[PDB]
Ligand binder design. Structure first.
Ligand SMILES: *[B@]1(C2=[C][C]=C([C]SC([N])=[N])[C]=[C]2)O[C]([O])C(=O)O1
Ligand SMILES: [Ca+2]
Length: 223
């Protein structure tokens, strides 16, 4: 997250870190046994880390749970990033508490202009590199579909939306992949793609979670 703020420990209790020897992606806890992340975060050997603030220090509220199964969306296209969503099943249920909590799925899609909370442990620089150890947050509005399409001509599908700031300076960035975009208390987006970070006229592009609720529900009812 570039141009954001330190969330505060465990104030985003649905945020997970995906770990394969190192943090490589975020995700969102949707119930005690499942995480939603980006399909472009898929790899084997994932450990889910819940209750994190500082990802390099054991602070006392963590739960580390290996993944048993990952399910990439059936129509995921890694070239276009259309349908950039995946479910990850935990090998054992998380213990839900004040610091480890699920985020609700949407029942309606969010509106342009709504302010959302984007979070992650990604780079905090638009040029150069610095990784925070503690969770960073950004408040960002959903952009109109016409601004989004004008920013990324030929590339925005109905399964995507833009959020952020056209003037740049405030955005998600490398390492935030797969993490939440929460609007009105519901998981509405997943950190998906963009051109650079915090560049002018190049906001973040997020997977439109509301279009996937029926797939998520059916998938978790059978796995
Ligand atoms: B991801 C990843 C981070 C950030 C985006 C948004 S870019 C922007 N302009 N808002 C995307 C995708 O990619 C790498 O795989 C990583 O681990 O983070
Ligand atoms: Ca920790």
């Amino acid at each position: 997250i570039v141009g954001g703020y330190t969330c505060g420990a465990n104030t985003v209790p649905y945020q997970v870190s995906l770990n394969s020897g190192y943090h490589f992606c975020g995700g969102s806890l949707i119930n005690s046994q499942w995480v939603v992340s980006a399909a472009h975060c898929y790899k084997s050997g994932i450990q889910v880390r819940l209750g994190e603030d500082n990802i390099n220090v054991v602070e006392g509220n963590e739960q580390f749970i290996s993944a048993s199964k990952s399910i990439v969306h059936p129509s995921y296209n890694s070239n276009t990033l259309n349908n950039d969503i995946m479910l990850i099943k935990l090998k054992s249920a998380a213990s839900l508490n004040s610091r480890v909590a699920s985020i609700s799925l949407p029942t309606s899609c969010a509106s342009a202009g709504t302010q959302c909370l984007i979070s992650g442990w990604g780079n905090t620089k638009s040029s150069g590199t610095s990784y925070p150890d503690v969770l960073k947050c950004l408040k960002a509005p959903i952009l109109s579909d016409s601004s989004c399409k004008s920013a990324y001509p030929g590339q925005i599908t109905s399964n995507m939306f833009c959020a952020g700031y056209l003037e740049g300076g405030k955005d998600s960035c490398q390492g935030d992949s797969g993490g939440p975009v929460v609007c009105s208390g519901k998981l509405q987006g997943i950190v998906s793609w963009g051109s650079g970070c915090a560049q002018k006229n190049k906001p973040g592009v997020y997977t439109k979670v509301c279009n996937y609720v029926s797939w998520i529900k059916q998938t978790i009812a059978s796995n």
